Design a binder for this molecule. Structure first.
Ligand code: FES
Ligand SMILES: [K+]
Ligand SMILES: [K+]
Ligand SMILES: [K+]
Ligand SMILES: [K+]
Ligand SMILES: [K+]
Ligand SMILES: [K+]
Ligand SMILES: [Mg+2]
Ligand SMILES: [Mg+2]
Ligand SMILES: [Mg+2]
Ligand SMILES: [Mg+2]
Ligand SMILES: [Mg+2]
Ligand SMILES: [Mg+2]
Ligand SMILES: [Mg+2]
Ligand SMILES: [Mg+2]
Ligand SMILES: [Mg+2]
Ligand SMILES: [Zn+2]
Lengths: 168, 108, 110, 193, 119
RNA sequence: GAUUAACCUUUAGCAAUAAACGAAAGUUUAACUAAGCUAUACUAACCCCAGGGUUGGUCAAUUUCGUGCCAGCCACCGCGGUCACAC
RNA sequence: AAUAGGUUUGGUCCUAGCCUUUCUAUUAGCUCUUAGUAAGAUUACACAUGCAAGCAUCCCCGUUCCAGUGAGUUCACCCUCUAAAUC
């Protein structure tokens, strides 16, 4: 079997289930948590379960962890403008932490829907080309158009071998 | 191994595949230097017809001549292919019957 | 606000102060191992301009990108000392702490 | 041989001879390909009938000359379609040769096109969100003035005889390399009587 | 591959197979190969009549206007397609070649009549 | 030409597209287009016309003779010393 | 490595390598009817001969492209800035 506890975390399906997509202003996210203490339990589960999901959706945001540096756990975000956002997470569960940061610094469902639509404009259905980029390679694939000679030989009148023969 | 160790060592590295006597080529051209017979290792008994050829790569090697009867002589051209002669230790090349100077086996 | 430097804001740990007005900072990022699908730390060194020579080996600093590099390897400047080594101030309460223990109780100033 | 069911092929599957040979199982149930190894070749033979001669182990279709692959003989075609998924079995599944598998695939598709063979027809959504036909692309466009009067769209579409001085200027510029002066072209395209 | 100078052009890239031509309308650097790298595909052109007796031409007019507005040139066959579509005026040589064809057939009709008259 | 196990014609045309130049009609182009050669592949077809390899087990399939650990054979295990389904 | 299979021993189980069965490409043997289509030196070795870049009222512009090859090899991608070029 897969090594370690909760091996579901090391699957692409789990990593894509993160709902936190930071706004373009977020540049750094530091996590200060304590390894022991009942009031820092939600912060430990947040580091254990959610940090991978956050990093997966935000590959260019620096995430750095710090252990047992202060008496209580907290998150701190550094924005491109120079503003810093402190989030106290003591007593909160890891799910409440994810919902909190999503509200204050995450893109809403509307902003994400629009971005997905602007991507669909890059693969125009009417364009012809390789399968990697287009639905169809040649117009001969469209029913009603003259098919490819490799499958249906063209009439002798539409072939240059006999156009030049008759003309010559 | 642990996940940390697997990450540190990276993906496995296949041993670089070794080239056989043909040097990774289908066939090779050769010049016959001498003919002779070899005894197979036990429990087989025979006088298997072989020959030493100078390959087009400059290397000299022993080659087995399959079929009943041959007419190879020194200074003749032959095409050699892969495939070991199971009971002849060290013989890893075979002459192609019906190419260049080595003709097809004469029927019966 | 524009800058030709790639890393605009980065947090790191000071690992060297032997250059004049320059702090050597170790910055770590999480990088996904494609086969194991596990995140591992990937560290990189940055030289940061420290005009006042206030950086100590071991403190956590915030680096800001310069408009243009001031030297071959100096592309950033010390913007702020986040955690001074051995002299941390709890941002949540503003009180000095030593590890997970307060040096001054938050109840002192109510 | 000559099959008496070539005109009404669906009758053979209803006869007693068929029931005695196949029963209630598909015609390909008892067929097995001859091949080396445990993994068979990924293509069946090209054809079992080669120049009117049959191979040694003919496929389920070619071994019975009374089985006719026809888009109307739907009871035979259903035996080569998965009853649970509606997909057509690939040839190695039943062992039919490539020749007969193509004729089965074409007959199955022809039977579906005629409505003789039931297949899943999904429920799709409409193409358009709005069904208005008021836009100018599908309505009338106010005709341009030239189109109403019967003139060309631009006046320079028509031939205009150039002045005589300008033609003299060109006859001097190209003196010695001239063609015959052309007049106005026909008003319409002529036609061979 | 940065070229020396050059410019973008909207032109026809030949596709299809032998005796079965098919054109893709593309914006590309004029120095690039005919069928090679392009900037954007702007439509297609099937010169062979289909089962309905039609030559199909697709034009991405929104993007064609964009690239012309960005300084893109037009090849002569492309200008004639836009003239036939009514997007551009009829090219001067489409008008002139039509007149030449009329004069050519007016002489043949005259030769045919003179032959029948002699008969 | 030599060399390698490796082997396409000392064809045609600028008619289409592309490129260069020209204000332009246009001109040029071994790019390209249309042909030639070749089971390397795909598709289709043919009244007449099928070959190649296998047949001890793995692995679909051998009759009669000859040979006699010889001659020979196999990818692996093996076969052949006088009844060899293995030559 | 798979739905797996053969092979270690007097025998069993375990471990393990090798090989078999599948799908491609090149070359070789033997063999080969037609049509359409695609693809097509082993060699950065040496090359006979022909052709492959012109255009145009002179200036200019073009011949820096296309076509070729794979010797060398993190100059190919993103960001910042900013020439030349097109409009
Ligand atoms: S691929 Fe379309 S004509 Fe051949
Ligand atoms: K033996
Ligand atoms: K041309
Ligand atoms: K084994
Ligand atoms: K010029
Ligand atoms: K090139
Ligand atoms: K190379
Ligand atoms: Mg053996
Ligand atoms: Mg070849
Ligand atoms: Mg020529
Ligand atoms: Mg050709
Ligand atoms: Mg005997
Ligand atoms: Mg035998
Ligand atoms: Mg034994
Ligand atoms: Mg090389
Ligand atoms: Mg400029
Ligand atoms: Zn069959």
């Amino acid at each position: 079997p897969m090594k370690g506890r909760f091996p579901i975390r090391r699957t692409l399906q789990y990593l894509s289930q993160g709902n936190v997509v930071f706004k373009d202003s977020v540049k750094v996210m530091t996590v200060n948590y304590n390894t022991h203490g009942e009031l820092g339990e939600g912060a430990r589960k947040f580091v254990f379960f959610n940090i991978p999901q956050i990093q997966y959706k935000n590959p260019w945001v620096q995430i750095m962890m710090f252990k047992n540096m202060t008496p209580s756990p907290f998150l701190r975000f550094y924005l491109d403008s120079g503003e810093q956002v402190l989030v106290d997470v003591e007593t909160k569960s890891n799910k409440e932490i994810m919902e909190h940061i999503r509200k204050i610094l995450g893109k809403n469902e509307e902003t994400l829907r629009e971005e997905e639509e602007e991507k669909k404009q890059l693969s125009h259905p009417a364009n012809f080309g390789p399968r990697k980029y287009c639905l169809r390679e040649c117009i001969c694939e469209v029913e009603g158009q003259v098919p490819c000679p490799s499958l249906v030989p063209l009439p002798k009148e539409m072939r240059g071998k006999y156009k030049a023969a008759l003309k010559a | 191994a642990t996940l940390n160790q697997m990450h540190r060592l990276g993906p496995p590295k296949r041993p670089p595949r070794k080239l056989g006597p043909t040097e990774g080529r289908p066939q090779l051209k050769g010049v016959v230097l001498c003919t002779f017979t070899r005894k197979p290792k036990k429990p087989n008994s025979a006088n298997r017809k072989c020959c030493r050829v100078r390959l087009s790569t400059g290397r000299e090697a022993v080659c087995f001549i399959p079929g009943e009867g041959h007419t190879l002589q020194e200074h003749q051209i032959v095409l050699v292919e892969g495939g070991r002669t199971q009971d002849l230790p060290g013989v890893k090349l075979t002459v192609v019957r019906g190419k260049y100077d080595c003709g097809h086996v004469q029927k019966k | 606000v524009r800058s030709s430097v790639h890393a605009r804001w980065i947090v790191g740990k000071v690992i060297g102060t032997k250059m004049q007005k320059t702090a050597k900072v170790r910055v770590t990022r999480l990088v996904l191992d494609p086969y194991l699908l596990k995140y591992f730390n990937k560290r990189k060194t940055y030289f940061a301009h420290d005009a006042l020579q206030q950086c100590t080996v071991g403190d956590i600093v915030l680096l800001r990108a310069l408009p243009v590099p001031r030297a071959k390897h100096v592309k950033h400047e010390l913007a702020e000392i986040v955690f001074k080594v051995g002299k941390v101030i709890d941002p949540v309460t503003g009180k000095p702490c030593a590890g997970t223990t307060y040096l001054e109780s938050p109840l002192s100033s109510e | 041989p000559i099959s008496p069911y070539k005109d009404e092929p669906w009758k053979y599957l209803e006869s007693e001879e068929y029931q005695e040979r196949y029963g209630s199982r598909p015609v390909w149930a008892d067929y097995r390909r001859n091949h080396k190894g445990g993994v068979p070749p990924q293509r069946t033979r090209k054809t079992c009938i080669r120049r009117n001669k049959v191979v040694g182990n003919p496929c389920p279709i070619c071994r019975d000359h009374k089985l006719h692959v026809d888009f109307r003989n739907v009871k035979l075609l259903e035996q080569f379609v998965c009853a649970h998924t509606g997909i057509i079995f690939y040839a190695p599944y039943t062992g039919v040769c490539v020749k007969q598998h193509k004729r089965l695939t074409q007959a199955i598709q022809k039977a579906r096109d005629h409505g003789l063979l039931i297949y899943h027809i999904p429920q799709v959504e409409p193409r358009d969100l709005d069904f208005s036909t008021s836009h100018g692309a599908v309505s009338a466009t106010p005709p341009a003035p030239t189109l109403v009067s019967g003139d060309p769209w631009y006046p320079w579409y028509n031939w205009k005889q150039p002045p005589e001085r300008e033609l003299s200027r060109l006859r001097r510029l190209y003196q010695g390399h001239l063609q015959e002066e052309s007049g106005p072209p026909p008003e319409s395209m002529p036609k061979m009587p | 591959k940065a070229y020396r100078g050059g410019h973008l052009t909207i032109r026809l890239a030949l596709g299809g197979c032998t005796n079965r031509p098919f054109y893709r309308i593309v914006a590309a650097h004029n120095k690039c190969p005919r069928d090679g790298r392009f900037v954007e595909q702007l439509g297609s052109y099937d010169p062979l009549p289909n089962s309905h007796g039609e030559k199909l031409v697709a034009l991405n007019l929104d993007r064609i206007r964009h690239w012309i507005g960005c300084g893109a040139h037009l090849s002569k066959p492309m200008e004639k397609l836009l003239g036939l579509a009514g997007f551009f005026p009829l090219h001067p040589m489409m008008i002139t070649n039509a007149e030449r064809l009329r004069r050519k057939r007016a002489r043949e009709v005259l030769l045919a009549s003179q032959k029948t008259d002699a008969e």
